Amino acid sequence: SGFRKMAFPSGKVEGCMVQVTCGTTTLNGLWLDDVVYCPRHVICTSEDMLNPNYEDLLIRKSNHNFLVQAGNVQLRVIGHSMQNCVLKLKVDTANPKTPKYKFVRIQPGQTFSVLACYNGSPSGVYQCAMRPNFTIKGSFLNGSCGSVGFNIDYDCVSFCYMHHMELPTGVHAGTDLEGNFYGPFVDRQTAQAAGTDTTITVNVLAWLYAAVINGDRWFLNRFTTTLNDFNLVAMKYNYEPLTQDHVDILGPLSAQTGIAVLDMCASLKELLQNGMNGRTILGSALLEDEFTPFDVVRQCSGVT
Amino acid sequence: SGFRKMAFPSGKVEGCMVQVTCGTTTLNGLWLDDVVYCPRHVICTSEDMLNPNYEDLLIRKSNHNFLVQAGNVQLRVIGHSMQNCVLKLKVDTANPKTPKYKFVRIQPGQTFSVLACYNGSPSGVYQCAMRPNFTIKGSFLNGSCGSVGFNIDYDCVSFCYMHHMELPTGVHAGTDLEGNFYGPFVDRQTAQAAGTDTTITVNVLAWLYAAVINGDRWFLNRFTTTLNDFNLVAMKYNYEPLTQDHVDILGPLSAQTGIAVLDMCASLKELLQNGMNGRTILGSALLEDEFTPFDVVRQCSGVT
Ligand SMILES: O=C(Nc1cncc2ccccc12)[C@@H]1CCNc2ccc(Cl)cc21
Ligand SMILES: O=C(Nc1cncc2ccccc12)[C@@H]1CCNc2ccc(Cl)cc21
């Protein structure tokens, strides 16, 4: 028993982290096979970031201008290309530590682990979610760009995120491994509206099922609701509307606990309308939404 | 900016995890050099755990009865010995992935990362603290025994915890890597009193400094207090008494923000007496205590 915000073991990703320097800028890159992936803003100075023409800036750069270091050894760059907001640096050596991998573009509300890196060296690993407004609430300092988000399925690492920037609001924006930003964000130092950050309803319900499984049951009530009645409450509290697809994904948790999804919705409705009254659920005084239904099942079953 | 419950990158520890089987019991072990460390209760059945005589049970076991598997390869056991509540299995092969390591017995209130494992395979990594009552609030299922807690300083892994048991209360007890339990716990299935779980005051203050650094400032007030006045409040709220040693450890954070330690104590005093009034600090609706002052500095400076 016990429920923690658990991240995937980061070893497979640590073996892919490299340092990329271009001119006076240094950030992290991801070395898989003979390609190093990194944010294209490695070619920029702070002066350039106000309004950069990436194509014009990249023309002034050659393979020898991209310094790629894996630990204490230098990689030889034999090709460079820009794909959306990422640079792909072809090197002459395949990473001997390349795990089985995929590049995936996750959905808002899905979770992933982040391996925060500086100068190609990992500092820590934490779990987070892609918010409905396509930002992530991470922990990144200057130099963390190029740090990646990922999920692991047995031996296969699915890379879903590459860190690019911090918005003036203190939240984070980045791209998938094809260089496309999640959300409307651009790699420019300009005013960028994140959008309303709603609560991921299906994840709160999954975490409520995790609470019951691990003994926290005080919030269970004698009520039920309907999807339309529950959604009127979810609208009022800036929660995502719950759909039958979400009900279906909560099926296994509903089966494990014997608590119908709509009965758990009535518990959540009452918690939204009445608050926690100073009580906690799984060591939290607020409703947690960065655990998907898959995460709760995985953690409660011990998948390695 | 941003503040997360960050764990150390687990790669160095993943390379040490092995599966240990004895009779019908399977748990995890830690392979460093030519020794595999695991909980001594690997020699027990469920029948034995009610009142085991470890010395008498171990006499019936030989080197060939301890099955040690590293991935898909079998390790040859050439020696076995019991040190406190851990077994040390000498194998004929040094772990080629052994990192620089130390065995350390941490203090209550200190934090560490846990790599939860099942059948010698890692499932996840999370950060936690040794509670003042010497329990840890982890996430462990049956088969997780032998999973380890650790800290990393540049290239050196300091192993501080090995998981042994779950108390009927749902909290966790374990040993240092010399096999000595943290707290009064014994490796027996019996009624065990955890003790009052107090809040780690120095860690709450460090997290309050982390909040100010990352922009959350609403809780700052026009007041100050003294150590003795603050401690009267800390006593009432089951908080650890704050000492001048704790004030001294908060020195760098106090210097960084320009907020005197006793002024931050007055902010904490007011939060204890008045609550959060529905507000949050660093995404939390309660006072967080599993970030040491060293952790806040490390995360806010980007140490790799
Ligand atoms: O945001 C960026 N980097 C960071 C990333 N994360 C956390 C940071 C914390 C503190 C300083 C920098 C941080 C960079 C720096 C310049 N401005 C800028 C503008 C657009 C783009 Cl694409 C990248 C950047
Ligand atoms: O506690 C133990 N293991 C576990 C460890 N962690 C989380 C568990 C969750 C669910 C079932 C088992 C779990 C073992 C099992 C038997 N009882 C027992 C008694 C004493 C000692 Cl030293 C070990 C044990």
Curated annotation (Swiss-Prot), chains A, B:
It comes from the Viruses. Changing Q189A: Does not affect ability to cleave and inactivate human TRMT1. It catalyses: TSAVLQ-|-SGFRK-NH2 and SGVTFQ-|-GKFKK the two peptides corresponding to the two self-cleavage sites of the SARS 3C-like proteinase are the two most reactive peptide substrates. The enzyme exhibits a strong preference for substrates containing Gln at P1 position and Leu at P2 position. 3CL-PRO exists as monomer and homodimer. Only the homodimer shows catalytic activity. Interacts with host FBXO22; this interaction promotes the proteasomal degradation of nsp5. Cleaves the C-terminus of replicase polyprotein at 11 sites. Recognizes substrates containing the core sequence [ILMVF]-Q-|-[SGACN]. Cleaves and inactivates human TRMT1, preventing tRNA guanine(26)-dimethylation of tRNAs. May cleave human NLRP1 in lung epithelial cells, thereby activating the NLRP1 inflammasome pathway. May cleave human GSDMD, triggering alternative GSDME-mediated epithelial cell death upon activation of the NLRP1 inflammasome, which may enhance the release interleukins 1B, 6, 16 and 18. Also able to bind an ADP-ribose-1''-phosphate (ADRP). Residues 1-304 form the Peptidase C30 domain. Changing K90R: In strain: Beta/B.1.351. The chain holds residues 3264 to 3567 of 7096 of the full protein. The gene is rep. This is 3C-like proteinase nsp5. It is found in: Host cytoplasm; Host Golgi apparatus; Host nucleus. Residues 1-304 are cytoplasmic. There is a cross-link at K5, K90 (Glycyl lysine isopeptide (Lys-Gly) (interchain with G-Cter in ubiquitin)).
